[PDB]
Symmetry: C3
Subunit: 431 residues, 3 copies
Amino acid sequence: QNITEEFYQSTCSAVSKGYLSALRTGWYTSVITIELSNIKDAKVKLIKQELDKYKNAVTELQLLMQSTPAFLGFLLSVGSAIASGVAVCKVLHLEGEVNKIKSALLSTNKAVVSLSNGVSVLTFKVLDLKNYIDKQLLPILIETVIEFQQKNNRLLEITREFSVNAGVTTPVSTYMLTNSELLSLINDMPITNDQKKLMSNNVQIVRQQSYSIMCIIKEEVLAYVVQLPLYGVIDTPCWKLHTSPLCTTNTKEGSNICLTRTDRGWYCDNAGSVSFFPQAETCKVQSNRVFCDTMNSLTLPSEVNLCNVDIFNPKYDCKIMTSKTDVSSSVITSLGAIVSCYGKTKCTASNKNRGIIKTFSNGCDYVSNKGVDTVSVGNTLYYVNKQEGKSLYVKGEPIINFYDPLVFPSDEFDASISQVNEKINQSLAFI
Amino acid sequence: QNITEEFYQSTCSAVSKGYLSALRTGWYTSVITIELSNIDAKVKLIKQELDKYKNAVTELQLLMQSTPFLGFLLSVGSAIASGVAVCKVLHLEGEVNKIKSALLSTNKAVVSLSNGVSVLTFKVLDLKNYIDKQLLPILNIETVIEFQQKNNRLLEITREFSVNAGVTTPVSTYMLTNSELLSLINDMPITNDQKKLMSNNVQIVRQQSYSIMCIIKEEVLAYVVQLPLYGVIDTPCWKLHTSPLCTTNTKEGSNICLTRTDRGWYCDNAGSVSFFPQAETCKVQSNRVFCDTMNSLTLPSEVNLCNVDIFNPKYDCKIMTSKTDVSSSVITSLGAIVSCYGKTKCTASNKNRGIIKTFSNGCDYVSNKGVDTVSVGNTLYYVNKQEGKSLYVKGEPIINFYDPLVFPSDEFDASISQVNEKINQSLAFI
Amino acid sequence: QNITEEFYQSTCSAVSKGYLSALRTGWYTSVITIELSNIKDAKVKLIKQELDKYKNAVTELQLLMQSTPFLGFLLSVGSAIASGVAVCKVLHLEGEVNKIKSALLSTNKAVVSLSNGVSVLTFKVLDLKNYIDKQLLPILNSCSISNIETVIEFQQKNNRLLEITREFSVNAGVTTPVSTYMLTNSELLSLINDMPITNDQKKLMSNNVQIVRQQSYSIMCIIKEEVLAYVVQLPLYGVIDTPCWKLHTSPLCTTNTKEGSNICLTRTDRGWYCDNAGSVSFFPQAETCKVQSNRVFCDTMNSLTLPSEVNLCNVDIFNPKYDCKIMTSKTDVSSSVITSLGAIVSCYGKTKCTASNKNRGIIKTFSNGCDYVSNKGVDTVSVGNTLYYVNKQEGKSLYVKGEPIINFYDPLVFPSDEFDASISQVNEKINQSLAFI
Ligand SMILES: *[C@@H]1O[C@H](CO)[C@@H](O)[C@H](O)[C@H]1NC(C)=O
């Protein structure tokens, strides 16, 4: 859609608006099964070599079944992403539970099984090795050799991925679940029509946010749980907040005070509140849609958005940190770049065909990506995002000029506007 | 075994007891060798397949060139230093020849290196034998397939080493098969109790092992597999869960917070306590916790007193202060800690019965008995359904003992005594 | 070369000198293309099974094309693949793939001038349209082919496409390091050789191809007009052979008997330092650099540009030209730092801190405070219940004797728990506390 961005000179921050939400709120757990076979000349020797790989893969999966679960980011909660999948896997260890799946997939490769614990799970049979080995390889004991290696390949690959990932893999590979299997799983998933179209148009993002959990191998059946994301929040407004240090620009070194907004990250409207994602690298952006997981979020009142327009508003205590580290840095935003230039650092913005077109002076400034290709801060070169969108420069006096350095708390790790004001009042009273 | 858990309302923390230790204290380094060879429509497939072998050897030669809350207090070390030491020995003249001669008659031998380390040495793939007897005279489609199967493991080993800078972890089944690993464990010069432990957790051994690409010389490809030795076994371990503890005043901006920063895994070890500040560095198998002592801090055993009496004089319990009253939850072994502040909706529900506990402002705790999920704001967390008894130790939140006008807020890494010291300095000025 | 190291007892820090720089400063973007074909008995089942893998890989690549893209907290925020994504955005323009398609008609290697002006080297590393249209089209248009060699030849020919699709699928279309399937050694060396760079840069990249792979990105881009194109982003080393040094720091605390009365001080400016264009490139997280013997490969994106006077903090932490960065606390836990030619040991409380030889046992027992031991005769360092191995690399260590600067401060007014402070900031806070008295 229409992505916009506003830079606030007063607080050295920028907000990118125009995004749509796709927040993970639930999990769909499906049981993927592979039917195995009960096993007690140069060409035939190749079959036994390939058959030993099958026997080793089963043994490795048995050993694998034993060892298996069966800025403000430090404020996040502690949870287990695969807990719902582990619950389905625990049920499969009950007596007769695997037989239910085995009987449901006797005539077809796709059925809905109601487990004993009550969970109704869609179950696939993606590879039938019992059918192949018992009917094609059992009576014998070059086309058979080649056909066997291709058919047996998927079991070997699934075993390798599970082995080097403690039985839990993410993203879900095409060997764990092919595109046709995943798309058909999405189509028959008991979800909204908006969710079906969303997941179908973003199959890769679904893979990256899914888990494959090695579960059980019993009664000639290998079963693993594929945990797919359910996006219960769709098409609500999201915005990304970029922050950078804001310092005074006094010439004499060591007399400068700094202030940095610590509330950077992704913000999305969610159920009357705002889901705040402090580590923006945990979200995946597709054009104008941002895919996040609510497990990596903090639930904040919607008034937190007021800190972008008025950092001194009384309705929300805007979070900042203070220091005297006036080092130069840059933040590449969605439609531009924030440049915090201090000291003797060379800060420029250049175009690919013409060289330097803007020289940044001391302080915090901003340039849009229109006509700009790269930004240099010191000895480092940064490439700006070339995505289309309008940027708006909101002129304002840097709020750091409002503070007296003699009483400014110049080392607050995780403070706020009111917290700094309270400390100033205590220091001024002593004077 | 018997997993128990105690929640301390006074300090907003919980301890899960009943675990047994398995701490990595040493390394066993083994030298894994693959013997290499110095080098029609159907033969065109062989020459294409032979180039894959030739490129993998060339790639390994280029690879040989490139030689191999309180977590910020951890020490700086190299996990593969012991394996690299063995790899440095293999570059000496005649050192590879000893391994080459020791594996002439068998695929498994114990070689004493020049530096003194006695290492078990495997020959897992013999390509010189295959190439010299079947492919040398030729330069039958069955031979082509036989070559691809024999050469497959070398391509995979080269592939894994290439995208991992020559050091891979966990050790894949291509670096070391289960039979090779089990036989390596069986002939390892360790106790029979340690052999059974490593054999019953071979995958965990893989996850805590390293494969170090080493040398390719004199028709021999050698890489070092570094297996963990668990020198601390079956000592008591406990996990400490912490969550922010804040006052619950209605008027915004007048609240102070306090959080115990000493969360993580704790295990008894040689008269002291090994403290693992980042609990994600340990692997739990039922009631046994596998950690690496390299990710631990050695603390006096009196650190345990912080759970029963945070104001005890024997240990200065570590805390951090702030005014960030955001709501959060911690899923423990047998329950969940919920820090609910402001206007946040914090509840605990059953899937068939709905909400059974509504958390009020402050720090509280719910056991997993009858509870399936915990909701804090817009986030849903699932509790552990494992069986075990929880004990709720009623207590006045210690944050109520402090005067907010002199309370040192925004202390990044402080302690009980350190906060008291700043309060006395602030009170004296008044 | 000659690696040396100096330990400063006064500040509980060590500097390792003698390294040479190889800093990533720019990106070279090349377009790697694979020409694909438009496609409408026991063996025919094998060919169609292998043909379905080709068709499934193309579909997966299409879905993949749809979804297209101590002081480290002070580092700048950027996108490492922005330059490659910018080139990939150009390839979505009409007729842009056709230009590449026509430019690689006669050769497998050509320089294409894009519409926006960027000149990119373009490779054709695999021609599947040539194989399928000439060998597989007549067979399927009739069936029942009788020599099995064609089936094996097809799967081997199709193998590289399957692997590239697999790596791109489980990595969101961006892979790093660049595998040999994305770009073979022969392809990479020829790409390096024809890269319009200095001969010094060519020799450096050729002798360290693995580091080039590890510092490169492969970005899946577009699949259109029977052409699969992905962008490989290779590192440009614009800073070469300048002096580098690594600064190791450890907490420096007092050793008072009464518990809880001790103050601590730690230099926070640890990391890699390299001379660069009159300033110093400072890499606070040293784990982001790769060391090859005595050459250090870093990426400037993980660096801060500091004035060269920052080096004065190693010889005189109280110098007036640069405000040396420190942090203060009262956390007297024991820890160790393994340096290039030794080990720093901060031993506090009742912890057992020793340095031992495997054949000779303990040769140094550390007392309370911060000390240092060289790797001469030392194999391991033990702090508490943890064992660390020292580097056995040859080199001279110099012990710069000095009284620990923490003894210069009065604990009653010492500003404890300063998360990110400095020498001057601590002095300023002390002066305000002393004025109140
Ligand atoms: C302050 O000093 C007194 C003794 O003078 C001591 O009892 C107290 O614990 C100290 N701390 C506080 C917070 O009062």
